[PDB]
């Protein structure tokens, strides 16, 4: 009984720690993705991870990198505690049904179940996080929120409670793409290395193939993550639909635009997952005692 509570608590705390550390990368990712959208811009102003971060620090200030952070922490507590903490339980449920799918298929189906539930519960916090990360006093549309709790109050009043779930469907599509692509690519890359005797079947080969899988999952996620960030950030009526947003991005900016923010997106995915997994294991083990 108590180990489930330890699993949930450990996943929540470990996700909060990883989110705090990675969060400047998230703001750089979002600002690179929204940068293409920004109307009437005469030139780009964010390029590179460190160039974006330094531009924001110099003009807007260091706290602006964090600007969405309380909604990030709320996302880690509500969404990531359920997503990561319940994974073992759902994989156990599927292992009791182990005739129904391969081990890879069971890992995928547990990931898709817990990720879908966690994305649905998470979505208000992502709408607030993204809107606060994208907004600037020196770009685009005027800032409309004085931080996280004001963002919730204003979105819920202006757009209704339904409005806080804006962009659920691209976020589901992104999380499905991440989970499927990362699991498939990891197992295929491990097979490729070991079966051809390219690397020893030991922790180095697993870490290398996990890096390759996490990159490929970020790459596949990226078009959907750009359209997600733009659709979530957009005031009402700017995009008639999510496919309208994707069509506009492709039509004016072209196919390179969908990848915008790819490098900070990958760096955050990898660094967040590493810090989260290390802290989750260490805290789960220590608290279990």
């Amino acid at each position, epitope marked *: 009984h108590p180990t489930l509570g330890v699993q949930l608590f450990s996943a929540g705390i470990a996700a909060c720690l990883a989110d705090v550390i990675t969060f400047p990368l998230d703001t750089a990712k979002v600002r690179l993705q929204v940068q293409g959208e920004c109307p*009437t*811009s*005469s030139v780009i102003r964010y390029k590179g991870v460190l160039g974006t971060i330094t531009a924001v620090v*110099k*003009t*807007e*200030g260091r706290m*602006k990198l964090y600007s969405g952070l309380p909604a990030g922490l709320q996302r880690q507590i509500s969404s990531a505690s359920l997503r990561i903490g319940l994974y073992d339980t759902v994989q156990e449920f599927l292992t009791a049904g182990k005739e129904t799918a391969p081990s890879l298929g069971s890992k995928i189906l547990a990931g898709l179940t817990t990720g879908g539930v966690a994305v649905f519960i998470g979505q208000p916090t992502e709408v607030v996080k993204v809107r606060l990360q994208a907004q600037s*006093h*020196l770009h685009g549309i*005027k800032p409309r929120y004085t931080g996280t709790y004001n963002a919730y109050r204003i979105i819920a009043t202006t757009e209704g409670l339904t409005g806080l779930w804006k962009g659920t469907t691209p976020n589901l599509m992104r999380s499905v793409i991440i989970n499927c692509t990362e699991l498939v690519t990891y197992d295929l890359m491990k097979e490729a290395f070991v079966k051809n005797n390219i690397l020893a079947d030991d922790v180095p080969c697993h870490l290398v193939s996990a890096l390759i899988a996490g990159f490929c999952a970020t790459a596949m996620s990226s078009p959907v993550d750009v359209v997600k960030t733009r659709f979530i950030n957009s005031p009402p009526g700017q995009y008639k639909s999510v496919p309208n947003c994707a069509m506009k991005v492709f039509t004016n900016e072209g196919p390179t635009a969908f990848f915008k923010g790819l490098v900070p997106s990958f760096l955050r995915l990898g660094s967040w997952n590493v810090i989260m997994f290390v802290c989750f294991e260490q805290l789960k083990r220590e608290l279990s005692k």
Partner: nanobody
Amino acid sequence: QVQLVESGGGLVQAGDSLRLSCAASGLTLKNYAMGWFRQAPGKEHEFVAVISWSGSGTSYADSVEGRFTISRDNAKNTAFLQMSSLKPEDTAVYYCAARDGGYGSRWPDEYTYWGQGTQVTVPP
């Protein structure tokens, strides 16, 4: 008790250069971002340039980027706007503004203190 006094405006020819100054009193400028705005006859305030409290971050309107240079002297409690290659469309009253935050903003209603303005005229 806070006052911002703009100076340096005048009549210049197209292609000429001009430097505006904004002297602050009653406040410690190093705690405020300083922005320049302009207002053409019959029009609203247009953002021109802003400089962060340290001066390490600056931003310019697309119509003036590459031609105007904003600077500040925290020891002299004064902000400056160097205008080069002036054009007839640069004719307007220029206002200095202080934002009670170290960083700049492009929205006039976000600035806490404003000067009286100085006229800049560029005949065709």
